[PDB]
Amino acid sequence: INENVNASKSRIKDTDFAKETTALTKSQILSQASSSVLAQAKQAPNAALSLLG
Amino acid sequence: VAIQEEITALNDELNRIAETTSFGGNKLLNGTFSTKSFQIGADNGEAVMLTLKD
Amino acid sequence: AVNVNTNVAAMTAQRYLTGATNAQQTSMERLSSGFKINSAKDDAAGLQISNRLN
């Protein structure tokens, strides 16, 4: 029983490194992507002053 | 008897897979998905029929 | 010509500029989000099927 219940507990609480590593990888990319977009957006208004203020 | 019982179960599993497999609720292997055309052309009529049997 | 109460050429510029700025925003959003159909405005049908697939 112990062995079986430990297995069940793992299926419910234990983490799957493969899927979790994947999400960490995906998270980092989306972060780097957003940061780049943010940087470009932060410069959007910089176009306005080009119109002689 | 045991083997028959075992297969009895697999038989049901096959039926389940058939009456559950779906591409967004459009059951695919139960038969309900008969020949459906896929317009793969920029103009009308340029389609290809796909048939999923039971 | 030689008028000082109308600059239709300028008006045209703004019109195109606006269109460009709008396009920039939509792309930026898609890039930052990672999804093309963010709002249903992008694709009413896409949202419908994507949500059900999700």
Side-chain angles (χ1 to χ4, degrees):
Chain A
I1 306 178
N2 196 2
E3 174 184 300
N4 302 303
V5 305
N6 298 305
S8 172
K9 185 177 53 57
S10 78
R11 301 172 178 119
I12 308 174
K13 185 183 180 58
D14 282 59
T15 202
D16 177 5
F17 282 113
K19 185 180 307 299
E20 289 315 300
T21 308
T22 305
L24 184 69
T25 307
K26 187 172 72 64
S27 304
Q28 290 162 359
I29 302 179
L30 291 188
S31 167
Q32 303 147 0
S34 306
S35 62
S36 312
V37 171
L38 180 72
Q40 298 171 118
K42 203 177 307 298
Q43 294 302 303
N46 195 4
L49 50 90
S50 80
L51 283 83
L52 196 76
Chain B
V1 167
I3 300 182
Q4 177 49 59
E5 171 56 59
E6 210 279 358
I7 304 186
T8 306
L10 290 199
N11 186 1
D12 302 359
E13 181 48 58
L14 289 183
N15 303 359
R16 188 197 71 63
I17 295 183
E19 294 285 354
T20 57
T21 297
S22 68
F23 184 66
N26 194 1
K27 262 67 180 180
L28 301 176
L29 298 198
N30 56 354
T32 57
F33 187 114
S34 181
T35 75
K36 292 194 184 300
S37 308
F38 292 67
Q39 173 59 238
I40 57 172
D43 300 299
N44 52 354
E46 314 182 1
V48 165
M49 140 193 330
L50 185 270
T51 169
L52 281 181
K53 311 166 188 56
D54 189 6
Chain C
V2 67
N3 38 59
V4 284
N5 287 121
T6 293
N7 197 354
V8 50
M11 263 185 327
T12 315
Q14 303 184 0
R15 176 175 47 117
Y16 286 122
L17 177 76
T18 57
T21 303
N22 296 0
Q24 195 168 359
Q25 194 284 121
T26 305
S27 182
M28 267 182 197
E29 172 184 1
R30 290 172 180 177
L31 293 179
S32 61
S33 64
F35 292 121
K36 189 205 312 296
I37 293 72
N38 295 300
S39 302
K41 148 172 47 59
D42 304 301
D43 186 2
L47 188 88
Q48 296 258 356
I49 178 60
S50 58
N51 293 1
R52 195 166 66 241
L53 283 194
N54 178 239

mmCIF file of all heavy atoms in Angstrom, chain A residues 8 11-12 34-36 38 43 45 49:
data_model
loop_
_atom_site.group_PDB
_atom_site.id
_atom_site.type_symbol
_atom_site.label_atom_id
_atom_site.label_comp_id
_atom_site.label_asym_id
_atom_site.label_seq_id
_atom_site.Cartn_x
_atom_site.Cartn_y
_atom_site.Cartn_z
ATOM 1 N N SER A 8 0.843 7.501 -5.937
ATOM 2 C CA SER A 8 -0.339 8.358 -6.195
ATOM 3 C C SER A 8 -0.011 9.791 -5.773
ATOM 4 O O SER A 8 -0.323 10.724 -6.537
ATOM 5 C CB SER A 8 -1.541 7.848 -5.468
ATOM 6 O OG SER A 8 -2.608 8.777 -5.581
ATOM 7 N N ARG A 11 1.909 11.470 -8.360
ATOM 8 C CA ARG A 11 1.092 11.821 -9.548
ATOM 9 C C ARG A 11 0.294 13.097 -9.265
ATOM 10 O O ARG A 11 -0.118 13.752 -10.240
ATOM 11 C CB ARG A 11 0.145 10.667 -9.889
ATOM 12 C CG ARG A 11 0.852 9.353 -10.189
ATOM 13 C CD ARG A 11 -0.125 8.201 -10.322
ATOM 14 N NE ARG A 11 0.538 6.950 -10.658
ATOM 15 C CZ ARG A 11 0.507 5.858 -9.903
ATOM 16 N NH1 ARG A 11 -0.019 5.906 -8.693
ATOM 17 N NH2 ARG A 11 1.006 4.723 -10.360
ATOM 18 N N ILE A 12 0.084 13.436 -7.992
ATOM 19 C CA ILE A 12 -0.782 14.608 -7.665
ATOM 20 C C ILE A 12 0.073 15.802 -7.232
ATOM 21 O O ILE A 12 -0.259 16.930 -7.637
ATOM 22 C CB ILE A 12 -1.801 14.220 -6.577
ATOM 23 C CG1 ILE A 12 -2.566 12.950 -6.953
ATOM 24 C CG2 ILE A 12 -2.740 15.377 -6.276
ATOM 25 C CD1 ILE A 12 -3.485 12.444 -5.869
ATOM 26 N N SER A 34 8.623 40.696 -24.445
ATOM 27 C CA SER A 34 7.868 41.860 -23.925
ATOM 28 C C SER A 34 8.838 43.010 -23.657
ATOM 29 O O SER A 34 8.536 44.144 -24.057
ATOM 30 C CB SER A 34 7.116 41.489 -22.682
ATOM 31 O OG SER A 34 6.287 40.361 -22.916
ATOM 32 N N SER A 35 9.962 42.710 -23.007
ATOM 33 C CA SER A 35 10.925 43.782 -22.657
ATOM 34 C C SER A 35 11.325 44.521 -23.935
ATOM 35 O O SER A 35 11.339 45.765 -23.923
ATOM 36 C CB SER A 35 12.124 43.215 -21.957
ATOM 37 O OG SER A 35 12.813 42.307 -22.802
ATOM 38 N N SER A 36 11.619 43.772 -24.998
ATOM 39 C CA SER A 36 12.021 44.397 -26.281
ATOM 40 C C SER A 36 10.882 45.291 -26.773
ATOM 41 O O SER A 36 11.144 46.459 -27.114
ATOM 42 C CB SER A 36 12.363 43.348 -27.296
ATOM 43 O OG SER A 36 13.230 42.372 -26.738
ATOM 44 N N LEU A 38 8.472 46.609 -25.047
ATOM 45 C CA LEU A 38 8.368 47.760 -24.118
ATOM 46 C C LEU A 38 9.396 48.807 -24.543
ATOM 47 O O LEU A 38 9.021 49.985 -24.679
ATOM 48 C CB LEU A 38 8.643 47.278 -22.692
ATOM 49 C CG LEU A 38 8.579 48.359 -21.616
ATOM 50 C CD1 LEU A 38 7.142 48.787 -21.365
ATOM 51 C CD2 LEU A 38 9.224 47.878 -20.326
ATOM 52 N N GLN A 43 9.867 54.326 -26.961
ATOM 53 C CA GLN A 43 10.493 55.325 -27.869
ATOM 54 C C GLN A 43 9.464 55.854 -28.871
ATOM 55 O O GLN A 43 9.813 56.748 -29.663
ATOM 56 C CB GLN A 43 11.676 54.691 -28.601
ATOM 57 C CG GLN A 43 12.824 54.313 -27.679
ATOM 58 C CD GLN A 43 13.329 55.508 -26.911
ATOM 59 O OE1 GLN A 43 13.731 56.516 -27.489
ATOM 60 N NE2 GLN A 43 13.302 55.409 -25.592
ATOM 61 N N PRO A 45 6.714 57.797 -28.445
ATOM 62 C CA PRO A 45 6.478 59.230 -28.324
ATOM 63 C C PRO A 45 7.698 60.002 -28.843
ATOM 64 O O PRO A 45 7.526 61.095 -29.331
ATOM 65 C CB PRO A 45 6.304 59.447 -26.817
ATOM 66 C CG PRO A 45 5.831 58.109 -26.304
ATOM 67 C CD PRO A 45 6.568 57.102 -27.161
ATOM 68 N N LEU A 49 8.186 64.536 -30.788
ATOM 69 C CA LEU A 49 9.003 65.777 -30.721
ATOM 70 C C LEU A 49 9.685 66.017 -32.070
ATOM 71 O O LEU A 49 10.047 67.175 -32.350
ATOM 72 C CB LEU A 49 10.020 65.659 -29.580
ATOM 73 C CG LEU A 49 10.857 64.382 -29.553
ATOM 74 C CD1 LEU A 49 12.142 64.552 -30.348
ATOM 75 C CD2 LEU A 49 11.169 63.977 -28.121
#
